[PDB]
Structure formats: C-alpha cells, structure tokens
C-alpha cells in the first residue's frame, strides 16, 4: 500500500510508519486494498465469502469455519500477520517491516508518537509525522483524527 493506492470500497489512512486501507461501513479487507461485504454466519450458503479482515468462510461430519488467509493468524478474534503475534506496541499497531527481507513485526505509531528507542521501539516517544496522503478531491485535504491521517472535507 502506497500513497498511489486506491482502496476499493475503503479509504487510505496513515500512521507513523505505514499506510493501510480502512474499509467503509462494515465491510472487511479481502486483500490489502479491497473491501467486500462480510457474512455474519459461516455455513454452506456463505462458503468462500469474507467473514473478517483477511479471513473467509471455508469448508473443513461437514462443517464451515472462519479461517485466516495464509500468512495470518487468529489472535484475539482478529487475523494479524504471523510475525506480529507476540508484539505489543502501545500507542499504535504492529506491522511487518518492509525494509526487512525477513518478515518481522515492528511498531507503527498513532500520529504524534514515534518508535521509542528508549522503550524497545514501542510507540511511546512524542514525535511528528508529515502527512503524505494524496487527497484527490479538490474539497478534501489530509486531516488528523484519532491517531491517524485520512482525507476529509476542508
């Protein structure tokens, strides 16, 4: 996901160390830039449909269950990258380090915090992040709310 990404049925948000797609309404991510409607019950009628971010209803007597996509693990009812399983970040979230060829969880922080080298790089140091978002609509601009940047009305 980059500043040039268009999130399908969602919108880009920016944290201190990454961008990601946030889904509109109650849709869920089927990949990093695509949101689709979510089924409430996994069964025969809803098989293969999305049931959560990076998880879909699959067939496994016969039964159906919500399972994370390859590379993700169910942790506290949420699919997160495998390498983020044991990571705690404080004022932010764990993401995979794009600079490291070896998949490794690192912290990306709520706007106004940055990784704190005095606190094992958790999101506990005050520091600024320049907004990078390209807000295409002439009436919109990058705005900070609730620890993220997103495009919103001027």
């Amino acid at each position: 996901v980059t500043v040039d990404t268009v999130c399908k049925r969602g919108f880009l948000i920016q944290m201190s160390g990454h961008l990601e797609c946030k889904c509109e309404n109650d849709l869920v991510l089927v990949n990093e830039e695509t949101c689709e409607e979510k089924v409430l019950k996994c069964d025969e009628k809803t098989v293969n449909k999305p049931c959560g971010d990076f998880s879909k209803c699959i067939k496994i007597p016969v039964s159906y269950a919500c399972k994370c996509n390859l590379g993700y693990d169910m942790v506290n009812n949420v699919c997160i990258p495998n390498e983020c399983k044991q990571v705690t970040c404080g004022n932010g979230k764990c993401i995979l380090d794009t600079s490291n060829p070896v998949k490794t969880g690192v912290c990306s922080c709520n706007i106004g915090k940055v990784p704190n080298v005095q606190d094992q790089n958790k999101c506990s140091k005050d520091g600024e992040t320049k907004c990078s978002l390209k807000c295409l609509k002439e009436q919109e601009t990058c705005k900070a709310v609730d620890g993220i940047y997103k495009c919103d009305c001027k």
Partner: antibody, heavy 124, light 113 residues
Framework: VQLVQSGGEVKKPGASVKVSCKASGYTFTSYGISWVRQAPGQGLEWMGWISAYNGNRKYAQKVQGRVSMTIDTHTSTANMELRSLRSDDTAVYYC??????????????????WGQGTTVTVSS | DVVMTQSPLSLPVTLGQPASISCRSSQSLVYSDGNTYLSWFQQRPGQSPRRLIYKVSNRDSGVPDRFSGSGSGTDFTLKISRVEAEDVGVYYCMQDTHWPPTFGGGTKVEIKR
C-alpha cells in the same frame, strides 16, 4: 496532557448550568470529549459525547432532551450545558478525552485523560 | 443498554497480597471488528478517575506492572499482584463496544483488619 474544568456551581431547579473543559498538551481538534457524571456516593454515568474534529454529538437517553454540547476550537474548549435542572442532577461532572471519529475505529481508545471534575448542586 | 456488574462491592485487602475484581457484561463485548472494548479505571479518594487498562488487557503508560486485566466475551478480571497502600479507592470497568458506553457499579478496595 490535561483537561481543566470550570469551577463548582449551585443552581435552582429549572435553571441551566454550563460546564467548560479546556484541553492542553494534545491536539484537541483531532479528538472528542465525553461527559460523565457521578452523583454523591454513586457510580459513574455517561452523559454524551461531542467530536472536536467534526462537531458530531450523541447524548445519553436520560438527558438527551435537555443537554447541549458545543466546541470552541479557538480556545480548545468543550462545553456542556444541562437545562431544566432538577435535584437529581446534583453530581460531579467530568469531561474525558475521547474519539474524534464516531463512525470508524482506528487504534486509539478513548477516556484516556480526565478533567478534575465540576460539582453541580441543584436545590431550591 | 449493556449492564456491567462488578463483584465484590467492597474488597478488603492485605498490603502485599494479591487481589482481583470481577466485571461481567449482560452481552458480549466483542465488537463487529473482532475487538473487545473493555476498560478499567481507578478512582482514588477525592480524585478523578484514571484509566488503568484498555482493550481488556493493555496497561496505560505509567501504570505499574502489578495491575493486569484479562477475560473475554462477557467475563473480565482486574488483578493486582501485590496491593500497595496507594491502591485503595474505587475501581470501575467500562464497555464501549455497544452504545451507550456504560460503567460497572464500582468496587471499593479497603484495608483488611
């Protein structure tokens, strides 16, 4: 990071009261403000919420017809006006920093900072 | 409205001993995004509430390690591993999974004698 509330008030039944809450040490307009009251001896009760980011507001059913919440972005201040007061509005009223986007959840969890409280006494 | 029920109402503790407070909700606190929006607050005598825990088990900055939170679904626990004198006060849980946010009725930690 702090929220500084206005001083205590004494009011007659049927009057109104305006309590203010001034933010400093964080970006006020990136967040919102919830109001919570606590009657003497009793537990905490949520009254409502207003976004300093976009002005959306939501009121608890117990007060929804007689409360008004407003933002002054120039002074980083949230106000709560409670109208047609009655004796059972006697309480300490707290403001607390909360979400600015009431429609989406990100990675910020609200009620992380509280003001010092404002005592309101309603009595004839 | 979600009802939050805490127990016990009054909790006498011995300084240095563990203690634990229970919070039960009248419905599941797991939200449609998979997260559980359950928090714990400490209110020392004469002061404002202070958040200790958010999202069930995450400790706020500046909160001592002896506080921890656990649980899932409708059943939650705040544990103090070794009570210190400064921990006397009233503790509240709060859900904001379902609107309106609602608080438990509170648990008063006092000195046992």
């Amino acid at each position: 990071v702090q929220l500084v509330q206005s001083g205590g008030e004494v009011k007659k039944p049927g009057a109104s009261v305006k309590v203010s809450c001034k933010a400093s040490g964080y970006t006020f307009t990136s967040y919102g403000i919830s109001w919570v009251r606590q009657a003497p001896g009793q537990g905490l009760e949520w009254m409502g919420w207003i976004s300093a980011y976009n002005g959306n507001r939501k009121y608890a059913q117990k007060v929804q017809g007689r409360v008004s919440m407003t933002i002054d972005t120039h002074t980083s201040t949230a106000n709560m006006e409670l109208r047609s007061l009655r004796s059972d509005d006697t309480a300490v009223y707290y403001c607390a920093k909360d979400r600015g986007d009431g429609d989406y959840r990100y990675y910020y969890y609200g009620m992380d900072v509280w003001g010092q409280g404002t005592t309101v006494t309603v009595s004839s | 409205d979600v009802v939050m029920t805490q127990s016990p109402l009054s909790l006498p503790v011995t300084l240095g001993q563990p203690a634990s407070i229970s919070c039960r909700s009248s419905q599941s606190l797991v939200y449609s995004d998979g997260n559980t929006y359950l928090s714990w607050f400490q209110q020392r005598p004469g002061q404002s509430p202070r958040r200790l825990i958010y999202k069930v088990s995450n400790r706020d900055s500046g909160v001592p390690d002896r506080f921890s939170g656990s649980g899932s679904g409708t059943d939650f626990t705040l544990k103090i591993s070794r009570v210190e004198a400064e921990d006397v006060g009233v503790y509240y849980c709060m859900q904001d999974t379902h609107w309106p946010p609602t608080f438990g009725g509170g648990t008063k930690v006092e000195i046992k004698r």
